[PDB]
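Technical appendix A lists one of the benchmark inputs used to test multi-chain prediction within the project. The record comprises two sequence entries:
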Amino acid sequence: RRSEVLAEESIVCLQKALNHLREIWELIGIPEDQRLQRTEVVKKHIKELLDMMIAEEESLKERLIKSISVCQKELNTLCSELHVEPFQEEGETTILQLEKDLRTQVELMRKQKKERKQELKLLQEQDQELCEILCMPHYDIDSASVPSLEELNQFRQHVTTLRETKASRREEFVSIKRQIILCMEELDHTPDTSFERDVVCEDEDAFCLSLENIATLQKLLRQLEMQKSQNEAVCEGLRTQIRELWDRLQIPEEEREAVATIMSGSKAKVRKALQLEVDRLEELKMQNMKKVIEAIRVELVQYWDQCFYSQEQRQAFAPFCAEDYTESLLQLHDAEIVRLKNYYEVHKELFEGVQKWEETWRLFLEFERKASDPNRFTNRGGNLLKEEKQRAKLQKMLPKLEEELKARIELWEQEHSKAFMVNGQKFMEYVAEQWEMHRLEKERAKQER
Amino acid sequence: RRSEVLAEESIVCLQKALNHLREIWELIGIPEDQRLQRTEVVKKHIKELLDMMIAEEESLKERLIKSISVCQKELNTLCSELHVEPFQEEGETTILQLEKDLRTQVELMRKQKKERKQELKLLQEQDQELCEILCMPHYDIDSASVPSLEELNQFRQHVTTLRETKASRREEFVSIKRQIILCMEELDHTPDTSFERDVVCEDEDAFCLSLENIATLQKLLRQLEMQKSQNEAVCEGLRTQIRELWDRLQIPEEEREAVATIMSGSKAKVRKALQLEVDRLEELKMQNMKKVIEAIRVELVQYWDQCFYSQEQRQAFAPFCAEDYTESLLQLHDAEIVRLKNYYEVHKELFEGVQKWEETWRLFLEFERKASDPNRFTNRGGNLLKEEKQRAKLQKMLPKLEEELKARIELWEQEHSKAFMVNGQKFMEYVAEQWEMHRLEKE
């Protein structure tokens, strides 16, 4: 109302000024011509200014009103694209205020739109990122244009669940790697594969966490466990074989407790040591049986020096040589030597007398040689009579044997049959041949007397 | 009531405009703040403009008053100078019209001021120009400041009178110049003086028409006129002497006419010719008296033989033997020939007898000679008788003559006295002294 009064005040000012100008035009003489020529200037300036400001405001009405008319199309645009009810009031209803508020709400909803597009951009920046790793497809909108709150939250839950699954698969990767490492450390493997080097050495983050690479990881663990299982099986075999030779040989407590260290974790370089021990134990059995079989062969030689010996009867055997020691060899020697022992115990006295004859014979030859006077009396060993005295006893002992030996031999053929060889044939023929050489020596020495 | 109408018209326009603009401010919601601002803008600007208008009007009004004041004082001062005729118009004073009027009157007063001052300068210029030539004083001022109409009149009348005097001086100059010209023509002067040659040859406009050169001029004219008068007087004297010589001489009337042309003016030609004429006439007179004197001398010598003379008588008189032919000498010779002719004529009867005796005696000697020589008979002229007879007659006449003659010779010495001689002595003795020369010639 102050302005509405200041208007009337201005009018009053004008009227007063005009009155004054009319006064000073009277104090001095001034024609109506110059008076009108001076009032015309004032009216001109006035009209000019009035037209100026009134143009400013008249144009201003059109400006604000057009601004509103456009702004409403703009809001109807921005309330359709964005599912939100338009806002308004019913008091002012003031052109200025209405225009200002309309432009305000428009700017606001543009900020909203920009924020939605931006949020969408970030969501995409996470989506394309994660989908590359899990090898999952995205995402079917397909709107680089406009979104909605419902759709926004949908994609939000989508991404969050994606992060959940990604974290889970990451945990799986972690654990399985933690196991694979131990397996490779056990088998002493070292990767040597592009994939293996990725898993073990690239040390995250990797890889394409699609079901493919994961399945390959699982398969790798299965392979390491396969090799480990193989090791355990084989070395179980060896560990059991050493128990076999344990029981067969001796299995002492101390030795067993010693090898018990080797009776441990299969999957290593232990295998070589165990195979070494097996070859060593087999060789040990071979050499032990070698000692035993050698000994028994010596006993065979002794028992063949006890009776016998046709070298063809020595060759009547077979296990001589025997560079191979196939255990059963021992089982052969046992049989032959047992047979030989029993057979000896059967014809014991026979062979006893058989040696008795050669002993008595050689001795008797020595005594006859001493009695044949190589020097005698002058060069010999007294007593000289006792030598004859025993020579007689020997000479009595011989035919008692010869008759007793010719009996058992002739009895043996009836008992066993059918031939006889005693490093010569038969045996009493050798005897008679020795009696022959002796009696011939004596008959020839008799001519020397 | 028309400017007032347009004024109320503008008030209406303003009111309407304010109403409409306020209405626009009510339609569109203006929070009064901007209203109160804009109204302030309007009132401020308009009050500024109107105050500019008013201030301009006040400045111009006060200025007009100042102009009226200055022009008023100025007009007082412009009324004092020249003539005090202030002018006032009754009716409507009217500030503007009064200013325009006072300004105009000031303009006109300045105008006639400059006009009268310039006219003063010009009048002084003419004044000096003329006063340089007429050599008159000027003027009684010079008071170059301010003139009055009356003073203008005084200077004017002064100049007019000066022009009159100038014209007069020039007229007299012309007349006297002409006269002097004719004078110098008469005597063939050829000016010769710086003044003479300015006057004659320079032929205007000079010299200084002062009292100086005018007095000098008239003095020169007096000199030349005196010269001419002297000359004419001399010529008149010559003419008079010539006339006197005419009266003294025979002077033919047919010879007195052609000599009238020479007796004219007083030119040097006339002068010289007159002098020559006089000299010629004096010489002629002298030669005439000469001829006459010589003639009288020969008449004397005619009479110096008839009775006279003797060497003493030849020495007697004879003053003329130097030829000074005056009228006095003429008179002398006249007296002598008169006295001589009379001395002879008085004794003419007494003088003839001498020649008679001498002739008679001479021829007597002739006859006495021819009658003595005896060779006569053979070689002489007859008649001898006549000869002898005549001789006898002679001897008869001779002594009878001497008788009648000796009576007159003694009678003359009885008068004037006392003796006479002729070529010695002589005379009557010589008469007888010849008879003895005959008487001795006979022995």
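Chain B touches chain A through 46 residues (CB under 8 Å). The CA atoms of residues 107 and 167 of chain B lie 41 Å apart. Comparable benchmark entries are summarised in Table A2.
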